[PDB]
Symmetry: C2
Subunit: 156 residues, 2 copies
């Protein structure tokens, strides 16, 4: 059994606290918490490669992708491990987050501990972009700027 | 080969950036960087248990101590893994940090990635406290309040 947490901060009035809990036997990880200060609507939500905040959320690098796949949604068989889709901010700017995952781990070589969790300005198109949007869709989901981020740390 | 970084922040005018670099073959880890805003003199420097910033540096918990030992200095055979002794702030409030360690790892079950690095207000007595000071000495080194902290994250 394991627990982690990311405290999201940034330069855009967005903040939050997101917990990760992985069950004994490590099959399922529950990601939950809340994010405030968001424009109402859908916001892209990803675990990024680096837990490096020396350049704000920019130094977090690209999406966490240990298996070298294209970008997708969290339910997709082909996705980045760090792809957590969209969270939904209500009219009051608060998104309550609740995601169950078989792919997000807190133990082992694929652990997301030490990586950054990042919330974005726009909707993640889940790798469904078409036309000239498709290149960036299959890389990042076209979710726009990084509004807040935090390093995923071990929690009690 | 691996690299990590902690960006130290807090409520005391203290900040800094500390890098960790572990060589291929993972025997030696070099910890280096700088911390500013410090009172001149010696400041305790530890990796703590949790990378949890929900309650500032308080939620970092106690020292990282996977082998269940007493507190000591970094050169001691009996110490907490997270015990990094004192860093030294000059008259200008800046401490330049350079520490080599066989005990601090960036890979494996003892990795410090995901834990918090913490700089303290006072000198770490390295577990050498005597009299009524000895109980807290062998726990924390009596280094006083937590001035700044950051979660140790993966770096490029
Ligand atoms: Cl489970
Ligand atoms: Cl080495
Ligand atoms: Cu992203
Ligand atoms: Cu400490
Ligand atoms: Zn992705
Ligand atoms: Zn200690």
């Amino acid at each position: 059994a394991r627990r982690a947490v990311a405290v999201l901060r940034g330069d855009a009035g967005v903040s939050g606290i997101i917990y990760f809990q992985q069950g004994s036997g490590g099959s399922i990880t529950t990601i939950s918490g809340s994010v405030s200060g968001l424009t109402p609507g859908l916001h892209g939500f990803h675990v990024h490669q680096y837990g490096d905040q020396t350049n704000g959320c920019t130094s977090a690098g690209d999406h966490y992708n240990p298996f070298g796949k294209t970008h997708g949604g969290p339910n997709d068989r082909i996705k980045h491990i760090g792809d957590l889709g969209n969270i939904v901010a209500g009219a009051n700017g608060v998104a309550e987050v609740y995601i169950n995952s078989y792919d997000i781990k807190l133990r082992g070589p694929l652990s997301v501990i030490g990586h950054s969790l990042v919330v974005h300005a726009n909707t993640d198109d889940l790798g469904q972009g078409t036309g000239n949007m498709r290149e960036e869709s299959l890389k990042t989901g076209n979710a726009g700027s990084r509004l807040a981020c935090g390093v995923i740390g071990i929690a009690a």
